[PDB]
């Protein structure tokens, strides 16, 4: 120990003081303070090569300590593996540390997530998918484990970014952002995440909300000037404005995935336009016509029936189609996010409703007071 630490001391600035502190903590047998110090230690060396030698020291610690938080043990092991640059030894080390912890739980999940992340660059269908499935049940009635949840959701988001499941990636990215409730992450990182989440929402198979994505108070606020065309097209999708979409085509036409997926985006915006029209129209009329839908969605009258049927099948709107009269009777459109002016309008409508209720209650009471006293 003594000579090992003395020789390793000459690895970074100001190291001798921290090495002396570590020696003092070990001698005093303060396992947890030593653990905090070791966790903070790895951050110093930019290359982090000394940690590749402190493997023996941490092994010696954990051998007869075996009480320190195995979660922290897995964190330091993760740093060591990150330093290590050969996949096979990385996998073996992760497996052995997983066996070592096992009983702790909440750290086995972290080790599995590390294995998945390491193997994601090389092969997916053999390990990544079944590992994502495997880490699903120990997450049971045990919330607020952000320490593992963030890593797990990042791994899942990366996997779904691969393969090409935009909807699942959207769900996982939203989950990761929610799990890391505090931001404390680089502005560049959160801005890239915002861009990816917006693209996933646009390209998703069955995600028509664009009402909470727009007001996500953590990401969209950070793409407000750099790449504003994403926010602009998201607003166009939310408002169901096919004309604004077509005009903005120039901005997003440079995006390769969006350019490749043009029909899907067009059908999504057309369905959103139908929803917006149904919501805008008052409840008492709510009876749209084929020519109006065609004009609004920029499609010929013939395709109106198929568009409305797709909407009904997916579940955006409820109603019927009367080809003889060339009309659609919409009876229910999906709920959407409303602003404070619309909330106040709802309040006024409630006021009218309550006034009517009170009027009838007073009428009945006054007229039947004789029988009910």
């Amino acid at each position: 120990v003594p000579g090992f630490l003395q020789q390793s001391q000459n690895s970074g600035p100001g190291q001798p003081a921290v090495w002396h502190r570590l020696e003092e903590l070990y001698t005093k047998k303060l396992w947890h303070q030593l653990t905090l110090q070791v966790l903070d230690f790895v951050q110093d060396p930019c290359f982090a090569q000394g940690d590749g030698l402190i493997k023996l020291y941490e092994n010696f610690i954990s051998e007869f300590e075996h009480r320190v938080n195995p979660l922290s043990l897995v964190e330091i092991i993760l740093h060591v593996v990150r330093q290590m640059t050969d996949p096979n030894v990385a996998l073996t080390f992760l497996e052995k540390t997983r066996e070592k912890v096992k009983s702790s739980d909440e750290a086995v999940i972290l080790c599995k997530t590390a294995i998945g992340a390491l193997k994601l660059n090389i092969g997916d269908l053999q390990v990544t998918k079944e590992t994502i499935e495997d880490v699903e049940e120990m997450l049971n009635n045990l919330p607020g484990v952000t320490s593992v949840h963030s890593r797990f959701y990042d791994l899942s988001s990366k996997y779904y970014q691969t393969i090409g499941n935009h909807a699942s990636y959207y769900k996982d990215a939203l989950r990761f952002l929610g799990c890391v409730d505090i931001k404390d992450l680089p502005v560049s990182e959160q801005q890239e995440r915002a861009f990816t989440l917006g693209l996933a929402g646009l390209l998703g198979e069955g995600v028509f909300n664009f009402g909470e994505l727009l007001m996500h108070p953590v990401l969209e606020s950070l793409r407000n000037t750099d790449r504003q065309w994403l926010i602009d097209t998201l607003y166009a999708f939310n408002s169901g404005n096919v004309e604004r979409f077509q005009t903005l085509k120039t901005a997003w036409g440079q995006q390769p995935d969006l350019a490749a997926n043009e029909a899907q985006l067009l059908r999504k915006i057309q369905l959103l336009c139908l929803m917006e029209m149904t919501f805008t129209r008052p409840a008492n009329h709510r009876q749209l016509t084929f020519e109006e839908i065609a004009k609004s969605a920029k499609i010929t009258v013939n395709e109106v029936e198929l568009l409305v049927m797709k909407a009904l099948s997916v579940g955006l709107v409820k109603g019927s189609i009367d080809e003889v009269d060339k009309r659609v009777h919409m009876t229910w459109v999906q709920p959407r996010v409303l602003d404070l002016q619309q909330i106040k309008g709802m309040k006024d409508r409630l006021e009218f409703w309550c006034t009517d209720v009170k009027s009838m209650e007073m009428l009945v009471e006054h007229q039947a007071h004789d029988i009910l006293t």
Partner: protein, 65 residues
Amino acid sequence: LGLPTEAYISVEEVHDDGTPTSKTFEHVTSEIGAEEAEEVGVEHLLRDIKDTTVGTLSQRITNQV
């Protein structure tokens, strides 16, 4: 003006934007029933204000109003 009992059952709630799954209380229908002895005792004790009038009078007060 209503029943005095409200029943709740603890359930895990999964969101779409609220994200973290919290343990929330979910409503369950609650009603008041009684055995024969309990019914007899309650009816005996109910000599505070007794007004049966099962006819249109009660069908107007217990409901409508």
